[PDB]
Amino acid sequence: HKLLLLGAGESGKSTIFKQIKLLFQTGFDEAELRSYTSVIHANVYQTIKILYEGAKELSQVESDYVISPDNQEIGEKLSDIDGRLDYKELVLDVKRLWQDPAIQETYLRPDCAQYFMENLVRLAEAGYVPTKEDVLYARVRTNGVVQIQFSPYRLYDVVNAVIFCAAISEYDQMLFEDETKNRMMETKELFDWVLKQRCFEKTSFILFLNKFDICEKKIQKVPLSVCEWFKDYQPIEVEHAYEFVKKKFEELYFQSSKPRVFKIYRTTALDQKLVKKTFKLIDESMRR
Ligand SMILES: Nc1nc2c(ncn2[C@@H]2O[C@H](COP(=O)(O)OP(=O)(O)O)[C@@H](O)[C@H]2O)c(=O)[nH]1
Ligand SMILES: [Mg+2]
C-alpha cells in the first residue's frame, strides 16, 4: 500500500500529489478548493512582492527598472502586508501595481505565478471557487510529511514503491540555487544516489519523466546535446529524443547491477487525464 515521492527541485512531485488529490476521493474535496483559495491568494501577494523587491534592488545595483514614482505609495503597502496572517480592492491595486515595464523585464529574467497574474479579476469577487488548475498552480511549501490514504494505499510527499520525478525539460536549465550546476546532472546525481542506498532495495521503483509538454515545445529550438549527459545526441523526432533520454535513464539504472523491479513513465504532471492513466497502469501493475 506504501508509496513515497522523491524528486529534485521542481520535479513536479507535489503537483502529482495535488492532482491525485483532486482526482481521487479524499471525498472532501469539500470546499478543498475553498480552503486552498487562501493559499492561492498568498502566492498572488508574495509574487508581486518579490517582483517589487527585485526592480528596486536591480535599479540600485545596475545603471538603469525604474518604477513609476506614483506607484511606490500603493506599491510598498505590499511590503506593509508581510503575510501577518493568511491575509476587489487588492486586484485593482495589483493590476495598477504591474503596469510599469520594469518589473516585467525583471520577470523576463516561478513560471506558475504568471498564470495567477492572468486570473486576478476572477479570484477577486466573493463568488470565487478555484478551478482545478488554480489548485495545481498554487504553490504550497511542503513542511514535514503529507499522508494521503485513498483507494480507486498511502502516498507520502516531503515503503513498497518509490516514485521518482525527473523533469526531463530541465536539461536546458542550470540550478536555481546554483548557476554553475545543471539540473539534469543533479537529477542524474540524485537518481544514482537513491538507487545506491541500502534502504530502498526492497522497494519497487517507478520513474516519471515529467514536463514532457515543455520538452516537445523546447526541443525544436534548443539542441538536446547541450547536456553533457546528452552530448551524444544527434537527431535524424520528439519520440526518439524522449527515448534517447530514456536510454540514458535506463543504462544509468542498470549499472547499479547486483546479481528486481523497474518501471518508467512518460508523464505530464500539470495536466490530468494524462496522469489518471499513469496511476491506473501502476495500481493494476502493483499485483502481489
Ligand atoms: N509544464 C509543466 N510544468 C510543471 C508540471 N509539473 C510541475 N510543473 C511546474 O513545476 C512547478 C512546481 O513543481 P513542484 O510540484 O513543486 O515540484 P517539487 O518541488 O519537486 O514538488 C510549477 O511552477 C509548475 O509550473 C508539468 O507536468 N508540466
Ligand atoms: Mg516539492
Author numbering: 40 to 103, 107 to 129, 134 to 155, 162 to 204, 215 to 220, 237 to 314, 320 to 342, 347 to 375
Provide the publication's sentences verbatim.
In all organisms, the core G-protein complex consists of one subunit each of the α, β, and γ proteins and exists in bimodal active versus inactive states. Signaling is initiated when the bound GDP is exchanged for GTP on Gα, which results in conformational changes that dissociate the heterotrimeric complex into Gα·GTP and Gβγ. To avoid response saturation by active Gα proteins, faster deactivation is achieved with the help of GTPase activity accelerating proteins (GAP), such as the regulator of G-protein signaling (RGS), which binds to activated Gα to accelerate GTP-hydrolysis. The two domains of the Gα—the Ras-like domain and the helical domain (HD)—flank the guanine nucleotide binding site.
The x-ray crystal structures of the SmGPA·GTPγS and OsRGA1·GDP complexes were solved at 2.57 Å and 2.99 Å resolution, respectively, by molecular replacement using AtGPA1 as the search model. SmGPA crystallized with two monomers in the asymmetric unit and OsRGA1 crystallized with four monomers in the asymmetric unit. In comparison, the OsRGA1·GDP complex structure highlights how changes in the active site following GTP hydrolysis result in large-scale conformational change. Within the active site of the OsRGA1·GDP complex, interactions with the guanine ring and ribose of GDP are comparable to GTPγS bound in SmGPA, even with substitution of Tyr189 in OsRGA1 for the corresponding His186 of SmGPA. Although the backbone of the P-loop maintains position, multiple side chains from P-loop residues, such as Glu49, Ser50, and Lys52 in OsRGA1, shift. For switch I, the loss of the terminal phosphate breaks the key binding and catalytic interactions. In the OsRGA1·GDP structure, Thr194 (Thr191 in SmGPA) lacks an interaction partner and the catalytically critical Arg191 guanidino side-chain (Arg188 in SmGPA) points away from the active site. The loss of interactions with the bound ligand shifts the position of the β1b-α7 loop in switch I, which includes Arg191 and Thr194, away from the GTPase domain. Of the four OsRGA1 molecules in the asymmetric unit, three lacked electron density for residues corresponding to α8. Finally, the interaction between residues in switch III and the helical domain is broken, as the latter shifts away from the GTPase domain.
